[PDB]
Symmetry: none
Subunit: 158 residues, 4 copies
């Protein structure tokens, strides 16, 4: 199984670039490739949720049109992800996590399937068993999704 | 044989594939002036340029690029559409170039006289072509391919 | 002398990236380095003017806060630059031009001092005698400005 | 000697140096989350981080980065200011790191115990330092330097 994929926003969903104004309006972006990859995980029954340590601009979030439950301003990502885990009656082996930062490490080492984008910090890279050829905001979510579908194939054809 | 039609996939080829959001969010997309001019230069040399996508694309957003290119979006079957354009224009497959990136482009990439992908195209598309651009999608790949096409025209003449 | 520098907007002032919305609002950007370089040319008596073949978003232009007379939607850049030349009672040898595109070539080959950014088209590169190490929107204007001040030094210390 | 103060130039180091304009233009600037977290990590390890600029910089725009860093802008004489911060904090020059890019940073770059510039820093600044970052300004250079600093702390301990 994988039943949940949790994705860090800044650096996995996005390339980590922020564009900000004096009135605190922020622009961030995601790639079509990755949106498609989220669409396809959802289609197949895998819930995708977005997570962040940052105080992300309030509804820049919904403007993403990704239909994912999100939680920002997170200090203990293991706690919240474990809260999501308990909510969807889930097991740690069925939780996937794409991470990139030091604050992701607790989650990465704990989950059933861990990955990082090509440009993740050294510490997040050491914590995982799958390092994407693609970088954050540039196909890593799509790349990882296709890795996940390969695991479900293995269980299906077993 | 001389190129007379170029077909470009929209997302990740003409655009850089990104959707830029804020909240006052009419959505923003990004492209490179180099590529718009590449299209301009192809059209002036007598090469028709057309745009395509498997997905919805805002007529209005694309009109903002001022490319004056026949476009078809939400295209279920890209080869069927390009075939119909090819016949429409009285052309051979060898007279058709295709710059594409996604899997849905792969059939076309394999049939056309001249195929390419931008540097950051999916692995399947990269395998389907004779030319992988140095430049990435929405960041010079159309211009690069256009120049490649011009060099071929004078190599044959 | 150099008394006028003309700069193509897309690809010299900017990196040539356009960000556009369905309501045709455009975002473009310039680097602080280059703004400083324009400030410094102006301080020393050299007029800087901006030129474009493109139908640039109407007053994205003034929002640049660069204090340069501009003309967009230009089909014959040699004509207009020659119009500016005649207006400021100028000679072709005192006109400088930073260009990047095929449509810049007439101007580049004609002016007293020609340059292009590192990422200019092959054709614009062949037309000039100074190729910047810096790319468009990324220091080329500043780089070229410092090249111009070196020429005025040569005349001053002559 | 252990670093206890990092000073970063704002334009082209903390930001990518770009001013993004449109027309509804309150102006937009760009930075990298990697770098904000790099600052967060330095502060948590006990290293004070301060920002500086020879030019005006919007208090309000910078507050949007949520860095909680003492900042001085329109600074005529960067060495004089860093010297006053150094003394204020009871520090040696060897305890001070500086990431900078423009010419106005060069004096400081030469005095401090640990100097750096981002990849795209002016030629004069690059010459003034012991470390030129792979990453460019506003795109990971502060994080890169921060990690470099951490590696030094454990190399000495």
């Amino acid at each position: 199984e994988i039943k949940l994929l949790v994705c860090n926003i800044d650096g996995c969903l996005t390339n980590g670039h922020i564009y900000v104004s004096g009135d605190q309006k922020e622009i961030i972006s995601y790639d079509v490739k990755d949106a498609i990859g989220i669409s396809l995980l959802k289609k197949s029954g895998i819930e995708v949720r977005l997570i962040s340590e940052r105080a992300c601009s309030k509804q820049t979030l919904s403007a993403l049109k990704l239909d994912c439950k999100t939680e920002v301003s997170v200090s203990d990502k293991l706690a919240t992800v474990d809260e999501w885990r308990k909510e969807m009656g889930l097991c740690w082996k069925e939780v996937a996590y794409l991470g990139n930062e030091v604050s992701d490490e607790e989650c990465l080492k704990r989950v059933g399937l861990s990955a990082v984008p090509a440009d993740a910090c050294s510490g997040a890279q050491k914590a995982v068993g799958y390092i994407c050829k693609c970088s954050g905001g540039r196909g890593a979510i799509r790349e990882f999704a296709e890795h996940i579908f390969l695991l479900i194939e293995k269980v299906n054809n077993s």
